[PDB]
Design a protein around this ligand. Structure first.
Ligand SMILES: Nc1nc2c(ncn2[C@@H]2O[C@H](COP(=O)(O)OP(=O)(O)OP(=O)(O)O)[C@@H](O)[C@H]2O)c(=O)[nH]1
Ligand SMILES: O=C(Cc1ccc(-c2ccc(OCCN3CCOCC3)cc2)cn1)NCc1ccccc1
Ligand SMILES: Nc1ncnc2c1ncn2[C@@H]1O[C@H](COP(=O)(O)OP(=O)(O)CP(=O)(O)O)[C@@H](O)[C@H]1O
Ligand SMILES: Nc1nc2c(ncn2[C@@H]2O[C@H](COP(=O)(O)OP(=O)(O)O)[C@@H](O)[C@H]2O)c(=O)[nH]1
Ligand SMILES: [Ca+2]
Ligand SMILES: [Ca+2]
Ligand SMILES: [Ca+2]
Ligand SMILES: [Ca+2]
Ligand SMILES: [Mg+2]
Ligand SMILES: [Mg+2]
Ligand SMILES: [Mg+2]
Lengths: 54, 438, 425, 349
């Protein structure tokens, strides 16, 4: 049980106590999947208004 | 000095953020007007509190914060609250209609029409920063904005600020504070697409906060105001090292270094003590030993789980108030002989301790009693995976019948994202078990 | 977030009228549009249902539709008749003769464009249009045939807006003509496809309640309408009043509709009114869940709840509310599907309905509603197997195939509810 | 009323607890996967402890202690006894044992074996593991490489432990036995020892010479029901209960059962359960646990009691199922969910 890295200031102090030793998608890829979902939405909307047109 | 930008997303994120900044002003002595009498360098400075506050030539200290919600009801109260003139209009960003507790609606449909403007308002703040550290992102798991928009924002922040750190404060869904039945869906979906973009995430289960407020504050049915003021106490103790002089966790990167040996397992468990009701006139003040021992009672954790049946990989102790290093090590020595505290074999069994002498600040008239010393423990234990198991089980029950799925598909999401996000959580669950059980 | 209200036909206009009477009293608006209330939670969300006009007058966002002028002349002379915007009265003179085909295909077609003109004018003045609600019966010709035509046209022009209905289902015990099973079956198919939420108000249940519970030997349509306006006000409480619940029509639809076609709800209300004994929370929650209090003549014990919403009104200990709701769940946990965790939600609003210090409105999405659709389908088939009374419809241009398809779709919905009532975890 | 679920339908004991609870009129059974229960009669493996105590408005109780496996699986039993100061490498009532893998002590085993080598007195041991099902996989040898051969012959870790060569043998018969004591630990960690134990007998005469025949040496109930021809002659089912055994100890050795044996059993039960109490207690937890244990003891000719193993999912003697399962309801269940003398000995601590 040893203390380490004792730093002290006026606001407080810090230290470590050891008890025992041991033993991304690009912007274009984002915008495409965003627009791929938007197209799926408008396909769904087109099929609806076709159905309603029928 | 290096600056930190806070981003509050959705109702939960915004209301928690307003509770945190309220507390920050009380702690740093900033009035609702933005003026700070004790700040002697007018209109500038490199002090540690300026990591969270910029300064105007007129002496106003302005949060480095962005609020964003897809409906204006919540942010409008920020615009008309006690701290109304703390912020500028451009920091508050409103939509017209919200994500209706639909991840897909917040991520895909409504997200796309707002993400560019949010990033542009984030950019205005980052341009007023000499060296920017990264971001602290507040949000709910269950809201459609909190889950769907957050994950899109986090994706784009990794692209626009690839070398800056990103920390989350995430509200885990609890049915007792009114809950949409689809919050398990949104939680998993947002965790999956945010995981590789978040360096450290502090989960707060509303169930734990709710029961603490009932047990220790004797509030029979807590409100969001009761929950958020307690939450901000914890948040403040976690961020106090960023806003005050010190040597532990002075950098957002220190959080990952000190608490996250493996990137995917970046969900430290927070435990806080003491929580004492302000209606108790005199309360026998608890010692260093008694509040430190309370950090190992599940009843004080932000997430209900049993650390005894898992393994530790890191543990930080953040004290506020009258505390001396020797009291701490005396309290740790005794606690170790009495508690089941097993670390992973490939990690040192120890504690990183941080003490700030200023005791906790409490909102005048709030529910929390002033205390002479408090502690927040941040421990990365595999036991938190219990919370992933609960959420994943409910996800599984609803999804087996595809209940409510049509709401997400109808916004342009495909069913495959459901099982893709779920398989990611299945990997995360066994990541935890390989690390923590023999 | 504004809502546009539409009432079509005799039943739709008689029920809609009483709805505007009730809530206009709750929000403190007098029969001339002047607000004379005493609490400003009265007006925090008054824009949801009222347009603010000159001299701070409030005029309902209501469109009144019928194919004959009779009932709408009674509305205009009724108690709150002059509250309504005069240009929103849209009527013909021929009538619909209790004939779905006349309201949907011939007589209603001639008038529908005029209605949509008024709808568009109302929507154009909404800062954020939230959706539409429609009051109508399914057993007549205007509310049923033209009402579903309007819903189809509204969805074409506002495809991304929520459309809800309060739909009165016919019952042989309260019946005007023999063809009501035909008109209801054809209407249900329309609703399955084109509404987000439909509150099924069964005239059978409204009668039984009036007779067996409310002690009225000879129930009139006015007596059954009292219960409907009281339920409608309760169902819309959470949207009309500043509360902790921050939810629009879409959010509530999201939280109650697990499958698109299964959006037909069983409404309920407690206490049943026609008195001074204050009701205790435990009594409110038990009555609320009693089948004798549900306005759809279905036994909830014959099915399983997919979702449940409960809205309490008045000042009450919400701790005992949560206590009582959690206890009804746990004492009867088998009737709530286990593959939708935590599917019972609760809301509270401090302002009670006029005349009662406490009330509770029950909204249930139960698979037991299939009993209603089975009932209608049996009556439909009894005549259709002999093609009885079909000449009234073929003479308006319809073909027998359209009836066969409508019956098949309703028997499909029946089988859908039965699938999820047997489903397990 | 109260609600409960049953997720281990192979459990003789809680099948009877389940049926008695329903016969109370104030307990209702639900389907295994309904989460709105007050009590869980859980599965014995992969019990989802992490989903308990999160149902608003329901106090939840389960019939298993998360973490109790450390005591009821032989490999961890040995490791716990050796490494915990409360029990200590220097522990008198637990036989010399070593865990061997096919954290391994394969040769500190041989060191003690090569010490009994030196003084050339009884060097008999027995290898076994938790994978063995009613008497398969055991094997008793006198020389150590035949056992270690048998060790890696298969792929689950085993324990080597001193075979007690001079057991107390009942007469007439020259017969070995073991004692089973049933212990109930309730939600407050009271330790209740059931007043009624059983002695699982060997009806074969103990023979110190040949260890190959696996019947006069191995105690277990099915082995004697299956591969003993003379079984049941002395008592029914090779099961002697406490009154008979007490009377025998008085007539034969001028002593009592409590004085010569039970005092040591109660000491072993308490020290084992109190050792792990900090690790498994549910006193400040969001759900609570009780559990019934089966302690297996052996007695040597000096009337010294030895712990052999602890069983976390024990069966019971048929004659006492009724009394014991009723005691579970009173002490462990109704303790927490009340209705509208004592058969247990409370071991205070
Ligand atoms: N602790 C806490 N939780 C909140 C608060 N507000 C909402 N929640 C929780 O968050 C969930 C609801 O998500 P919201 O944040 O309200 O939704 P949102 O992010 O605004 O997104 P939308 O669905 O578009 O409205 C529930 O689980 C609530 O328990 C809050 O102020 N404090
Ligand atoms: O839905 C209805 C009838 C109704 C009202 C209210 C509820 C309801 C109450 C509480 C709930 O739990 C809270 C979920 N939290 C929201 C905030 O985020 C956190 C999660 C969920 C649902 C359901 N159903 N709408 C009226 C209406 C109908 C027809 C025509 C006009 C208006
Ligand atoms: N160290 C030892 N010395 C002498 N005999 C022993 C012994 N270990 C076991 N025996 C004999 O072996 C028998 C039990 O072996 P084991 O411990 O493998 O039981 P089990 O766990 O296989 C059956 P259950 O757990 O279902 O009750 C003992 O009762 C005893 O008669
Ligand atoms: N509850 C209720 N039901 C009505 C009312 N008027 C008619 N009905 C029912 O609806 C049918 C008559 O339909 P109606 O609305 O009069 O036809 P429409 O005017 O052509 O739409 C019958 O089944 C009645 O049971 C009313 O005022 N209240
Ligand atoms: Ca300064
Ligand atoms: Ca990154
Ligand atoms: Ca004409
Ligand atoms: Ca036109
Ligand atoms: Mg919102
Ligand atoms: Mg009529
Ligand atoms: Mg065993």
């Amino acid at each position: 049980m040893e203390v380490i890295e004792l730093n002290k200031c006026t606001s407080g102090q810090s230290f470590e106590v050891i008890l025992k030793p041991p033993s991304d998608p690009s912007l274009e890829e984002i915008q495409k999947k965003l627009e791929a979902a938007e197209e799926r939405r408008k396909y769904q909307e087109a099929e609806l208004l076709k159905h309603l047109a029928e | 000095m290096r600056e930190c930008i806070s981003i509050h997303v959705g109702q939960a994120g915004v209301q928690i953020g307003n509770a945190c900044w309220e507390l920050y002003c009380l702690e740093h002595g900033i009035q609702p007007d933005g003026q700070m009498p004790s700040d002697k360098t007018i209109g500038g400075g490199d002090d540690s509190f300026n990591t969270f506050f910029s300064e105007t030539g007129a002496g106003k200290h302005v949060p480095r914060a962005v609020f964003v919600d897809l409906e204006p009801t919540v942010i409008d109260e920020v615009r008309t609250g006690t701290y109304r003139q703390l912020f500028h209009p451009e920091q508050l960003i409103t939509g017209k209609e919200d994500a209706a507790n639909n991840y897909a609606r917040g991520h895909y449909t409504i997200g796309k029409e707002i993400i560019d403007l949010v990033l542009d308002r984030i950019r205005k703040l980052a341009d007023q920063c000499t060296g920017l550290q990264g971001f602290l992102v507040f949000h709910s798991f269950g809201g459609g904005t909190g889950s769907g928009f957050t994950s899109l924002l986090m994706e784009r922040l990794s692209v626009d600020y690839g070398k800056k750190s990103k920390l989350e404060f995430s509200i885990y869904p609890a049915p007792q504070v009114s809950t949409a039945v689809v919050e398990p869906y949104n939680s998993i979906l947002t965790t999956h697409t945010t995981l590789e973009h978040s360096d450290c995430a502090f989960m707060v289960d509303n169930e734990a906060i709710y029961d603490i407020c009932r047990r220790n504050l004797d509030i029979e049915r807590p409100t969001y105001t009761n929950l958020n003021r307690l939450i901000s106490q914890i948040v403040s103790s976690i961020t106090a090292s960023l806003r005050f002089d010190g040597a532990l966790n002075v950098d957002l990167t220190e959080f990952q270094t000190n608490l996250v040996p493996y990137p995917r397992i970046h969900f430290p468990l927070a435990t806080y003590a003491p929580v004492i009701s302000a209606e108790k006139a005199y309360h026998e003040q608890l010692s260093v030993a008694e509040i430190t021992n309370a950090c190992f009672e599940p009843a004080n954790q932000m997430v209900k789980c049993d650390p005894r049946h898992g393994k530790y990989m890191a543990c930080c102790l953040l004290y506020r108030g009258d505390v001396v290093p020797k009291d701490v090590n005396a309290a740790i020595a005794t606690i170790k002989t009495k508690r089941s505290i097993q670390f992973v074999d490939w990690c040192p069994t120890g504690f990183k301790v941080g003490i700030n002498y200023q005791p906790p600040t409490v909102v005048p008239g709030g529910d929390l009693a002033k205390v002479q010393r408090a502690v927040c423990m941040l421990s990365n234990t595999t036991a938190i995976a219990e919370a992933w198991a609960r959420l994943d089980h409910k996800f599984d029950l609803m999804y087996a019948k595809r209940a409510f799925v049509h709401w997400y598909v109808g916004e342009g999401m495909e069913e495959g994202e459901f099982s893709e996000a779920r398989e990611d959580m299945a990997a995360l669950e066994k990541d935890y078990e390989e690390v923590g059980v023999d | 977030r504004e809502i546009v209200h539409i009432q079509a036909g005799q039943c739709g206009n008689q029920i809609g009228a009483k709805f505007w009477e009730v809530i206009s009293d709750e929000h403190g608006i007098d029969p001339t549009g002047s607000y004379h209330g005493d609490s400003d939670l009265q007006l925090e969300r008054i824009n949801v249902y009222y347009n603010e006009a000159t001299g701070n007058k409030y005029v309902p966002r209501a469109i009144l539709v019928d194919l004959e002028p009779g009932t709408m002349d009674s509305v205009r002379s009724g108690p709150f008749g002059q509250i309504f915007r005069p240009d929103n009265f849209v009527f013909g003179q021929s009538g619909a003769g209790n004939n779905w085909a006349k309201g949907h295909y011939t007589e209603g077609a001639e008038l529908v464009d005029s209605v949509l003109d008024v709808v568009r004018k109302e929507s154009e003045s909404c800062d954020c249009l939230q959706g539409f609600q429609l009051t109508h019966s399914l057993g007549g010709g205007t509310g049923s045939g033209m009402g579903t035509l309007l819903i189809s046209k509204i969805r074409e022009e506002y495809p991304d807006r929520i459309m809800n209905t309060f739909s009165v289902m016919p019952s042989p015990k309260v019946s005007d003509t023999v063809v009501e099973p035909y008109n209801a079956t054809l209407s249900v198919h329309q609703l399955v496809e084109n509404t987000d939420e439909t509150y099924c108000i069964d005239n059978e249940a409204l009668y039984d309640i009036c007779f067996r519970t409310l002690k009225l030997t000879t129930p009139t349509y006015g007596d059954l309408n009292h219960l409907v306006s009281a339920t409608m006000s309760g169902v819309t409480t959470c949207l009309r009043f500043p509360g902790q619940l921050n939810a629009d029509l879409r959010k509530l639809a999201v939280n109650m509709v697990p499958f698109p076609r299964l959006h037909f709800f069983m409404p309920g209300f407690a206490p049943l009114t026609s008195q001074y004994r204050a009701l205790t929370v435990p009594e409110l929650t038990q009555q609320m869940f009693d089948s004798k209090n549900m306005m759809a003549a279905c036994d909830p014990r014959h099915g399983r709840y997919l979702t449940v919403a409960a809205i309490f009104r008045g000042r009450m200990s919400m701790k005992e509310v949560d206590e009582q709701m959690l206890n009804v769940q746990n004492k009867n946990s088998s009737y709530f599907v286990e593959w939708i965790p935590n599917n019972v939600k609760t809301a509270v609003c401090d302002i009670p309905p006029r005349g009662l210090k406490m009330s509770a409105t029950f909204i249930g999405n139960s698979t037991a509603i299939q009993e209603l659709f089975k009932r209608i389908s049996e009556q439909f088939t009894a005549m259709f197997r002999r093609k009885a009374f079909l000449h009234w419809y073929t003479g308006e241009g319809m073909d027998e195939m359209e009836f066969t398809e409508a019956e098949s779709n309703m028997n499909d919905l029946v089988s859908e509810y039965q699938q999820y009532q047997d489903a397990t975890a | 009323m109260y609600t409960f679920v049953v997720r281990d339908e192979n459990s003789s004991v809680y099948a009877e607890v389940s049926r008695l609870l329903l016969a109370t009129g104030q307990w209702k059974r639900l389907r295994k996967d309904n989460p709105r229960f007050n009590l869980m009669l859980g599965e014995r493996n992969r019990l989802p402890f992490g989903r308990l105590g999160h149902e608003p408005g329901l106090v939840q109780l389960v019939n298993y202690y998360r973490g109790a496996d450390k005591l009821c699986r032989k490999a961890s039993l040995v490791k716990l006894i050796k490494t915990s100061p409360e029990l200590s490498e220097s522990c008198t009532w637990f036989p010399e044992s070593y865990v061997i893998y096919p954290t391994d002590e394969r040769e500190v085993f041989l060191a003690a074996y090569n010490r009994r080598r030196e003084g050339r007195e009884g060097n008999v041991w027995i290898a076994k593991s938790s994978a063995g099902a009613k008497g398969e996989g055991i094997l008793i040898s006198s020389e150590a490489s035949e056992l270690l051969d048998f060790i890696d012959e298969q792929g689950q870790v085993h324990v080597i432990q001193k075979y007690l060569e001079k057991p107390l043998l009942l007469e007439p018969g020259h017969r070995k036995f073991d004692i089973r004591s049933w212990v109930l630990v309730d939600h407050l960690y009271n330790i209740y020892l059931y007043r009624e134990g059983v002695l699982r007998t060997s009806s074969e005469p103990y023979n110190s010479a040949n260890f190959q025949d696996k019947t006069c040496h191995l105690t277990n109930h099915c082995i004697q029901k299956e591969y003993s021809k003379n079984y049941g002659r002395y008592e029914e089912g090779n099961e002697m209960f406490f009154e008979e055994f007490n009377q025998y100890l008085m007539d034969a050795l001028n002593t009592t059962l409590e004085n010569s044996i039970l005092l040591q059993i109660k000491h072993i039960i308490r020290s084992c359960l109190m050792c792990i109490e900090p690790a498994i207690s549910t006193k400040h937890l969001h759900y609570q646990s009780f559990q019934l244990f089966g302690f297996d003891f052996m007695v040597d000719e000096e009337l010294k009691v030895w712990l052999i193993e602890v069983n976390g999912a024990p069966a019971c003697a048929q004659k006492l199922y009724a009394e014991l399962c009723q005691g579970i309801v009173d002490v462990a269940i109704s303790s927490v969910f009340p209705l509208a003398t004592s058969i247990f000995i409370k071991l205070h601590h």
